[PDB]
C-alpha cells in the first residue's frame, strides 16, 4: 500500500464534496451543444472538466490491508488468504468451517 495513493484517497473524499456535489443540475444544462449551436458560456463548459481525479473514474474500493485491487472480499475488506487467518481466530463474525 503506497503512501501517495493513501494520501490521494483522502484528497478524493475532500474533493468529491467540492467538484462532485451540487454541480449536477448545472452540468445537465451546460452539456448541451446542439439545441442552439451558439457559443455563450465556454468558461462554464470547461468547468465540467475541472475535476480530473475526484470523480467516479480512478476510484476503486481495494483490499484494505494492501491497497491491492485483487483477490479480496468487500463484505469484510480482507484478502482471499487473510480471511483464512481471521476465520481461524473467530475474528469474522459467525464464519466457520464444519463444527455445525
Amino acid at each position: 500500500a503506497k503512501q501517495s495513493m493513501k494520501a490521494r484517497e483522502v484528497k478524493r473524499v475532500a474533493l468529491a464534496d467540492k467538484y462532485f456535489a451540487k454541480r449536477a443540475e448545472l452540468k445537465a444544462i451546460i452539456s448541451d451543444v446542439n439545441a442552439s449551436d451558439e457559443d455563450r458560456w465556454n468558461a462554464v463548459l470547461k468547468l465540467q472538466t475541472l475535476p480530473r481525479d475526484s470523480s467516479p473514474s480512478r476510484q476503486r474500493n481495494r483490499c484494505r490491508q494492501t491497497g491491492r485491487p485483487h483477490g479480496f472480499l468487500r463484505k469484510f475488506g480482507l484478502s482471499r488468504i487473510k480471511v483464512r487467518e481471521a476465520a481461524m481466530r473467530g475474528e469474522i463474525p459467525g464464519l466457520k468451517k464444519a463444527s455445525w
Binding site: 451543444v33 446542439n34 449551436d37 465556454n42 470547461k46
Partner: protein, 79 residues
Amino acid sequence: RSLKKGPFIDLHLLKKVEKAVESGDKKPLRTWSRRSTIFPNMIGLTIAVHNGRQHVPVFVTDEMVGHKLGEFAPTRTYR
C-alpha cells in the same frame, strides 16, 4: 456521439489565433499536444508540436482537407 459533428475547436488554439494580432511577428509558438483538429482561422500563425523528444514546426494553409495536428508531426523513427 461527438459534440456537434465533425472537427471541433479548442480554446488553447482559439486564444493563440486571437492573440496573433496583439503579439505580431515571431518564431513558432509551442502547443505540445497533437490531438486538436485544424480550422480555417489557423492561417498566418506558425506553431510547433511535441514529437516525443523535441518539437517540430507546423503551418496551416487553404490547401488542407481537414486534419489533426499529429498529421503534421510523425513520432516514430523507422518506416
